[PDB]
Write a structure and sequence with these properties.
2 copies of one chain form a homodimer.
Chain A (H helix, E strand, L loop, with lengths): L2 E3 L2 E4 L7 E2 L9 H6 L6 H17 L4 E4 L9 H11 L2 E4 L1 E2 L15 H13 L12 E4 L7 H17 L3 E4 L6 H11 L7 E3 L8 H9 L3 E4 L10 H13 L6 E3 L19 H12 L4 H15 L2
Parallel strand pairs in A: 3-4, 4-5, 6-7, 7-8, 8-9, 9-10, 10-11
Antiparallel strand pairs in A: 1-2
Helix pairs in contact in A: 2-3, 4-5, 5-6, 8-9
The site of one cobalt (II) ion has 3 residues of chain A, from loops.
Chain lengths: 305, 314
């Protein structure tokens, strides 16, 4: 009745339950895979995604939000297959993931034309299916807010205003891209509480994280396990600090795990690391179950309502 | 047998006949087309491509070389359908068309791993078929020779050295990228005669063009009809001058026609001020008649359109 799900009837936000807000079943570069299909093994990809998702569900995860969009190899049919094999609630999105320029398709195309693509996926369905997009994903990274990155951001704001679906972002935690995304969306009329600024858990700069939260958006502590960006124990210290300072109303936690899509870079990276390490860490440091529920149930409910 | 053809037995290069060295049956952004198929009408693309190819064949064209590769929507199965509807000799390629950065697949991958993809397409076949690639296509434009652009350039060198297929380039005629491409490839051991430096017809700077040709490479006068890069009359004037100064044996001419393109610019849609007479047969309607009435004999026309493509693929 409000949040579309891959391969199922849409649900009211009250039924989302325990959510992993940012996880990927599979990512790839569309052009590479179309051109050199011998590099990929779909059977293996499917088997690893299904296993990872089953494991999450054994810890009580009900819904996964998967922000694989254009540029990351969104495949709605693969997603459907995983949903049939697992029973997971899966929220698919629309959007564009670029760091510099858009594909040449977009040359002399307006922001509204871009937004029309997102709205098509939200109102009509994704890739020829009746599976509808539940959110818009956008990105910026080390190159910053380029001209084309900015067009995409503005297009996301149009789609949100027209359809009410929330916006998930990718940012670089160390160069202000997050704060800029929030600002441009917000200036374009997006409710700050319909934005999740992503990858803030990549830094232990608490003042920058709070800045974005205090402007009204969710803060993505969303790469647990990617030690190369920030080690688990430092993420844990940051999370705990934010909870202790009263920020659990804006915290969202996830792994950004690539289910099929490393001893030094990400030794215990998986879709269940927060059950194995983070949540027990927090509980040992005095965080109650009510806070856990706020982060993994209440916050996603608010984001999608 | 020595040039692979899509949907046909390979041909000796001496049999290639009258050739258009750089034309596209269809181009698109793979990511866009994968994510928003509602934007594209395959029927219309197929009908347009077939119509263009048949009209080129009526003018005597035997062979078309199509440098649509990764980044431009190469689709060997579409190409097969076009061959089967027309009987054209079609040469498909491999390569990577980027202006700035490689797709994220290539993060922390070596130049060799890039080359192996090219070698795969040339020795094994394209996209799971046995249609083999006959050349490598690479690109550089306004952003210049970026690090990833250079990785692709060096990958093409390795592929040529291993398989012997020639290299076609896309360049920006106004920023030296063509000469940079030639430089880096010749440094890596590629024979200059196996390189076509593209889009040099986009300038009337005759001295730049000549510099590349004197270094031993073919020069692509290859966007006839794309008036936004350079109008037909200035292209014709440049082409003629090069032929008079003795450069016939290095000149290749084409239209770079996109029988179907997905960009919004779209150089011919309510916007045919950018490319009014642009089609795959414009050289038969304008350029060849112009050369012929300005002292260029049938021999020189045969050199450009038959002999040079034959050498390039030998
Ligand atoms: Co991200
Ligand atoms: Co080109
Ligand atoms: Fe992600
Ligand atoms: Fe081209």
């Amino acid at each position: 009745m409000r949040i579309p799900l891959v391969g199922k009837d849409s649900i009211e936000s009250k039924d989302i339950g325990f959510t992993l807000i940012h996880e990927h079943l599979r990512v790839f570069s569309e052009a590479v895979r179309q051109q050199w299909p011998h590099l990929y093994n779909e059977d293996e990809e499917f088997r690893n995604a299904v296993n990872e998702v089953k494991r999450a569900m054994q810890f009580g995860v009900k819904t996964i939000v998967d922000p694989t969009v254009m540029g990351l190899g969104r495949d709605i049919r693969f997603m459907e297959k995983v949903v049939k094999a697992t029973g997971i609630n899966l929220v698919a999105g629309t959007g564009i993931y670029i760091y510099i320029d858009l594909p040449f398709y977009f040359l002399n195309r307006s922001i509204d034309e871009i937004a029309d693509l997102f709205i098509h996926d939200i109102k009509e369905g994704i890739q020829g299916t009746l599976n509808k997009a539940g959110f818009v994903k956008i990105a910026a990274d080390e190159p910053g807010i380029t001209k084309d990155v900015e067009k995409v951001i503005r297009a996301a704001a149009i789609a949100n205003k027209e359809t009410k679906v929330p916006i998930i972002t990718h940012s670089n935690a160390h160069n202000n891209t997050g704060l800029e995304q929030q600002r441009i969306l917000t200036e374009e009329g997006v409710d700050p509480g319909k934005i999740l600024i992503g990858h803030l858990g990549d830094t232990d700069n608490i003042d920058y994280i709070k800045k974005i939260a205090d402007k009204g958006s969710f803060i993505g502590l969303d790469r647990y396990g990617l030690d190369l960006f920030l080690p688990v124990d430092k993420r844990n210290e940051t999370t705990l600090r934010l909870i202790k300072d009263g920020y659990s109303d804006k915290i969202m936690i996830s792994h950004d795990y690539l289910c099929t899509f490393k001893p030094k870079l990400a030794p215990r990276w998986s879709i269940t690391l927060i059950f194995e390490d983070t949540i027990p860490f927090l509980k040992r440091n005095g965080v109650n179950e009510e806070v856990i529920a706020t982060i993994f149930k209440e916050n996603p409910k608010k984001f999608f309502s």
